[PDB]
Design a protein around this ligand. Structure first.
Ligand code: INL
Ligand code: HG
Ligand code: ZN
Length: 258
């Protein structure tokens, strides 16, 4: 049937329905810190999430997404390697069944426990749908989650997970402040890539933050209690919803720091 992360419908099978899976700018990729080029022309990232309006959290059977009201420039991303303003539409995570895996991007082959993707679309394209039809339509801010001390800002998300256990469930999730998920530094690596899940569109300018945020094992453990399946179906734990690193091909990863 449809795509997933199972043995039968996982990443290795995606190309059959989405041939772009074998494209030229697929993500995630391995960030080789020594081959990444420091580009002093990269401006600092400008993350303005003060007016962020979260709406709800939903388990879509692939991960849980926290959606935001993107009808106006409420929460945006500018600067960095970006031209124009990008609106935050949603954030979701990719995590593993074990702490040593879960991130999609890896740094020098190192896998983190999870990876937060703050999805933004280029406002010059009017709506999200048109942005996914453009080479610079999306900007995903990726933040690695390292298991260590709890991230207070993530707790609100962790607490609501019980109400969206299965595929299709959703819960109101207003007044959540995404700034609480940002690491201290905004140093980053950037390269042109794609969505890491089908349709695997190559519309993303990836901005992967150098600095991971810490989450407690208890916090990550609650991610793992989610289900890929819908209610009434056999229980399949939502874990390892990550795509392996893809070939960098003809691309250079630029770093905003040296
Ligand atoms: C407009 O809201 C949503 C909700 C959940 C996923 C997605 N989008 C879909 C599924 N989507 C269907 C419509 O055409 C584009 C791809 C997959 C997907 C994967 C993303 S990721 N892992 O590369 O950051 S981001 C993202 S997404 O673009 O936000 C969009
Ligand atoms: Hg595209
Ligand atoms: Zn993602």
């Amino acid at each position: 049937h449809h795509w997933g992360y199972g043995k039968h419908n996982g990443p290795e099978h995606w190309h059959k329905d989405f041939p772009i899976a074998k494209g030229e700018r697929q993500s995630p990729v391995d960030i080789d810190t020594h081959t990444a080029k420091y580009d002093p022309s990269l401006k600092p990232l400008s993350v303005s999430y003060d007016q962020a309006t979260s709406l709800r959290i939903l388990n879509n059977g692939h991960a849980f997404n926290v959606e935001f009201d993107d009808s106006q420039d409420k929460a945006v991303l500018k600067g960095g390697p970006l031209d124009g303003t990008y609106r935050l539409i949603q954030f979701h995570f990719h995590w593993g069944s074990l702490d040593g895996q879960g991130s999609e991007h890896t740094v020098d082959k190192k896998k983190y426990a999870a990876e937060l993707h703050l999805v933004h679309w280029n406002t010059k394209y009017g709506d999200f749908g048109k942005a996914v039809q453009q080479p610079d339509g999306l900007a995903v801010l990726g933040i690695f989650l390292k298991v260590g001390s709890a991230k207070p800002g993530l707790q609100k998300v962790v607490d609501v997970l019980d109400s969206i256990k299965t595929k299709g469930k959703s819960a109101d999730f207003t007044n959540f402040d995404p700034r609480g998920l940002l690491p201290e530094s905004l140093d980053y690596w950037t390269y042109p890539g794609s969505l890491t899940t089908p349709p695997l569109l190559e519309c993303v300018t990836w901005i992967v933050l150098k600095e991971p945020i810490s989450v407690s094992s208890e916090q990550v453990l609650k991610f793992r209690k989610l289900n890929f399946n819908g209610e009434g179906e056999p229980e399949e734990l939502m874990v390892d919803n990550w795509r392996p690193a893809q070939p960098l091909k003809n691309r250079q990863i630029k770093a905003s720091f040296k």
